[PDB]
CSV table of all heavy atoms in Angstrom, one decimal:
chain,number,residue,atom,x,y,z
C,1,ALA,N,56.0,80.6,-187.5
C,1,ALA,CA,55.5,79.7,-186.5
C,1,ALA,C,56.5,79.9,-185.4
C,1,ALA,O,57.6,79.4,-185.4
C,1,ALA,CB,55.6,78.2,-187.0
C,2,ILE,N,56.0,80.7,-184.4
C,2,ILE,CA,56.8,81.3,-183.4
C,2,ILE,C,57.3,80.5,-182.2
C,2,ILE,O,58.4,80.6,-181.8
C,2,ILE,CB,56.1,82.6,-182.8
C,2,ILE,CG1,54.9,82.2,-182.0
C,2,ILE,CG2,55.8,83.6,-183.9
C,2,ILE,CD1,54.3,83.4,-181.2
C,3,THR,N,56.5,79.5,-181.8
C,3,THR,CA,56.8,78.8,-180.5
C,3,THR,C,56.6,77.3,-180.5
C,3,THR,O,57.4,76.6,-179.9
C,3,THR,CB,55.8,79.3,-179.4
C,3,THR,OG1,56.0,80.8,-179.3
C,3,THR,CG2,56.1,78.6,-178.0
C,4,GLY,N,55.6,76.9,-181.2
C,4,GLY,CA,55.2,75.4,-181.2
C,4,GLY,C,54.9,74.9,-179.9
C,4,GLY,O,54.8,75.6,-178.9
C,5,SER,N,54.9,73.5,-179.8
C,5,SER,CA,54.7,72.8,-178.5
C,5,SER,C,55.9,72.1,-177.9
C,5,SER,O,55.9,71.8,-176.7
C,5,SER,CB,53.6,71.8,-178.7
C,5,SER,OG,53.9,71.0,-179.8
C,6,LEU,N,57.0,71.9,-178.7
C,6,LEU,CA,58.2,71.1,-178.3
C,6,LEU,C,59.4,72.0,-177.9
C,6,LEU,O,60.1,71.7,-176.9
C,6,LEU,CB,58.6,70.2,-179.4
C,6,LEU,CG,57.6,69.2,-179.8
C,6,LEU,CD1,58.2,68.3,-180.9
C,6,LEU,CD2,57.2,68.3,-178.6
C,7,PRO,N,59.7,73.0,-178.7
C,7,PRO,CA,61.0,73.7,-178.4
C,7,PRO,C,61.0,74.3,-177.0
C,7,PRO,O,60.0,74.8,-176.5
C,7,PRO,CB,60.9,74.9,-179.5
C,7,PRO,CG,60.1,74.4,-180.6
C,7,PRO,CD,59.1,73.5,-180.0
C,8,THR,N,62.1,74.2,-176.4
C,8,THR,CA,62.3,74.8,-175.0
C,8,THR,C,63.5,75.8,-175.1
C,8,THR,O,64.3,75.8,-176.0
C,8,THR,CB,62.6,73.8,-174.0
C,8,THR,OG1,64.0,73.3,-174.1
C,8,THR,CG2,61.6,72.6,-174.1
C,9,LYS,N,63.6,76.6,-174.0
C,9,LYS,CA,64.6,77.6,-173.9
C,9,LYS,C,66.0,76.9,-173.9
C,9,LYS,O,67.0,77.6,-174.2
C,9,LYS,CB,64.5,78.4,-172.5
C,9,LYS,CG,63.4,79.3,-172.4
C,9,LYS,CD,63.5,80.4,-173.4
C,9,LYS,CE,62.7,81.6,-173.0
C,9,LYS,NZ,62.7,82.6,-174.1
C,10,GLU,N,66.0,75.6,-173.6
C,10,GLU,CA,67.3,74.9,-173.6
C,10,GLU,C,67.7,74.5,-175.0
C,10,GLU,O,68.9,74.6,-175.3
C,10,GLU,CB,67.2,73.6,-172.7
C,10,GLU,CG,67.4,73.9,-171.2
C,10,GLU,CD,66.5,75.0,-170.6
C,10,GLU,OE1,65.2,74.9,-171.0
C,10,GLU,OE2,66.9,75.9,-169.9
C,11,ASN,N,66.7,74.1,-175.8
C,11,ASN,CA,67.0,74.0,-177.2
C,11,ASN,C,67.6,75.3,-177.8
C,11,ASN,O,68.6,75.3,-178.4
C,11,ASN,CB,65.7,73.6,-178.0
C,11,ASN,CG,65.1,72.3,-177.5
C,11,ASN,OD1,63.9,72.1,-177.4
C,11,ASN,ND2,66.0,71.4,-177.1
C,12,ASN,N,67.0,76.5,-177.4
C,12,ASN,CA,67.4,77.8,-177.9
C,12,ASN,C,66.7,78.8,-177.1
C,12,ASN,O,65.5,78.9,-177.0
C,12,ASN,CB,67.1,77.9,-179.4
C,12,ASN,CG,67.6,79.1,-180.0
C,12,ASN,OD1,68.1,80.1,-179.3
C,12,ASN,ND2,67.6,79.2,-181.4
C,13,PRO,N,67.5,79.7,-176.4
C,13,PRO,CA,66.8,80.7,-175.5
C,13,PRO,C,66.0,81.7,-176.3
C,13,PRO,O,65.2,82.4,-175.7
C,13,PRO,CB,68.0,81.4,-174.8
C,13,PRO,CG,69.2,81.0,-175.6
C,13,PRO,CD,68.9,79.7,-176.3
C,14,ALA,N,66.2,81.8,-177.6
C,14,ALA,CA,65.4,82.7,-178.5
C,14,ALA,C,64.0,82.3,-178.6
C,14,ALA,O,63.2,83.1,-179.1
C,14,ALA,CB,66.0,82.8,-179.9
C,15,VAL,N,63.6,81.1,-178.2
C,15,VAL,CA,62.3,80.5,-178.3
C,15,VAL,C,61.3,81.3,-177.4
C,15,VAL,O,61.5,81.3,-176.2
C,15,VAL,CB,62.2,79.0,-178.0
C,15,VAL,CG1,60.7,78.5,-177.8
C,15,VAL,CG2,63.0,78.1,-179.0
C,16,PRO,N,60.3,82.0,-177.9
C,16,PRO,CA,59.4,82.7,-177.0
C,16,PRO,C,58.4,81.8,-176.3
C,16,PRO,O,57.6,81.1,-177.0
C,16,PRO,CB,58.8,83.7,-177.9
C,16,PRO,CG,58.8,83.1,-179.3
C,16,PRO,CD,60.1,82.3,-179.3
C,17,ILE,N,58.5,81.8,-175.0
C,17,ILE,CA,57.6,81.0,-174.1
C,17,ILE,C,56.5,81.8,-173.4
C,17,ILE,O,55.4,81.4,-173.3
C,17,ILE,CB,58.5,80.2,-173.1
C,17,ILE,CG1,59.4,79.2,-173.7
C,17,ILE,CG2,57.6,79.5,-172.0
C,17,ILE,CD1,58.7,78.2,-174.7
C,18,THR,N,56.9,83.0,-172.9
C,18,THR,CA,56.0,83.9,-172.2
C,18,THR,C,55.2,84.8,-173.2
C,18,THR,O,55.6,84.9,-174.3
C,18,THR,CB,56.6,84.8,-171.1
C,18,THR,OG1,57.4,85.8,-171.8
C,18,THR,CG2,57.5,84.0,-170.1
C,19,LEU,N,54.2,85.4,-172.7
C,19,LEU,CA,53.4,86.3,-173.5
C,19,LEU,C,54.2,87.4,-174.0
C,19,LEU,O,54.2,87.7,-175.2
C,19,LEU,CB,52.1,86.8,-172.7
C,19,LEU,CG,51.3,87.9,-173.5
C,19,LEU,CD1,50.7,87.3,-174.7
C,19,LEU,CD2,50.1,88.4,-172.6
C,20,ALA,N,55.0,88.0,-173.1
C,20,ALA,CA,55.8,89.2,-173.4
C,20,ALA,C,56.8,88.8,-174.5
C,20,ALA,O,57.0,89.4,-175.5
C,20,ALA,CB,56.6,89.7,-172.2
C,21,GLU,N,57.4,87.6,-174.3
C,21,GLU,CA,58.4,87.0,-175.2
C,21,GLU,C,57.8,86.9,-176.6
C,21,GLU,O,58.4,87.2,-177.6
C,21,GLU,CB,59.0,85.7,-174.7
C,21,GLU,CG,60.0,85.9,-173.6
C,21,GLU,CD,60.5,84.6,-173.0
C,21,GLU,OE1,59.9,83.5,-173.1
C,21,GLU,OE2,61.6,84.6,-172.3
C,22,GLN,N,56.6,86.3,-176.6
C,22,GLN,CA,55.9,86.0,-177.9
C,22,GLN,C,55.5,87.3,-178.7
C,22,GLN,O,55.7,87.3,-179.9
C,22,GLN,CB,54.6,85.2,-177.6
C,22,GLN,CG,54.9,83.7,-177.1
C,22,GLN,CD,53.7,82.8,-177.0
C,22,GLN,OE1,52.9,83.0,-176.2
C,22,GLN,NE2,53.6,81.9,-177.9
C,23,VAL,N,55.0,88.3,-178.0
C,23,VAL,CA,54.7,89.5,-178.7
C,23,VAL,C,55.9,90.2,-179.2
C,23,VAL,O,56.0,90.6,-180.3
C,23,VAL,CB,53.9,90.5,-177.8
C,23,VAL,CG1,53.7,91.9,-178.4
C,23,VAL,CG2,52.6,89.8,-177.5
C,24,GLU,N,57.0,90.2,-178.4
C,24,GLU,CA,58.2,90.8,-178.9
C,24,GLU,C,58.8,90.0,-180.1
C,24,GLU,O,59.1,90.7,-181.2
C,24,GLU,CB,59.3,90.8,-177.8
C,24,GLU,CG,60.7,91.1,-178.2
C,24,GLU,CD,61.6,91.2,-177.0
C,24,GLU,OE1,61.5,92.2,-176.2
C,24,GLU,OE2,62.3,90.2,-176.7
C,25,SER,N,58.8,88.7,-180.0
C,25,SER,CA,59.4,87.9,-181.0
C,25,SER,C,58.7,88.1,-182.3
C,25,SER,O,59.3,88.2,-183.4
C,25,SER,CB,59.5,86.4,-180.6
C,25,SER,OG,60.2,85.6,-181.6
C,26,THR,N,57.3,88.1,-182.3
C,26,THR,CA,56.5,88.3,-183.4
C,26,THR,C,56.6,89.6,-184.1
C,26,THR,O,56.5,89.8,-185.3
C,26,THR,CB,55.0,88.0,-183.1
C,26,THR,OG1,54.9,86.8,-182.4
C,26,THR,CG2,54.0,88.0,-184.4
C,27,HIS,N,56.7,90.7,-183.2
C,27,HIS,CA,56.9,92.1,-183.7
C,27,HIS,C,58.2,92.2,-184.5
C,27,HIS,O,58.2,92.7,-185.6
C,27,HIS,CB,57.0,93.0,-182.4
C,27,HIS,CG,57.1,94.5,-182.8
C,27,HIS,ND1,58.3,95.1,-183.1
C,27,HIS,CD2,56.1,95.4,-182.9
C,27,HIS,CE1,58.0,96.4,-183.3
C,27,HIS,NE2,56.8,96.6,-183.2
C,28,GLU,N,59.2,91.6,-184.0
C,28,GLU,CA,60.5,91.5,-184.8
C,28,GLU,C,60.3,90.8,-186.1
C,28,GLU,O,60.7,91.3,-187.2
C,28,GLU,CB,61.6,90.8,-184.0
C,28,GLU,CG,62.1,91.5,-182.8
C,28,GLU,CD,62.7,90.6,-181.7
C,28,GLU,OE1,63.0,89.4,-182.0
C,28,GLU,OE2,62.8,91.0,-180.5
């Protein structure tokens, strides 16, 4: 569960917010 609705970059910068971030994070 990659992103959810609550986590923000301030909670953790590893949280993927953008499309590019999401595809990368999921690929890993």
Side-chain angles (χ1 to χ4, degrees):
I2 65 171
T3 303
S5 56
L6 303 176
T8 76
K9 289 296 204 191
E10 277 59 42
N11 303 144
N12 186 348
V15 171
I17 296 308
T18 69
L19 174 59
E21 286 176 340
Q22 291 187 290
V23 172
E24 165 174 289
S25 184
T26 309
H27 185 277
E28 295 153 14

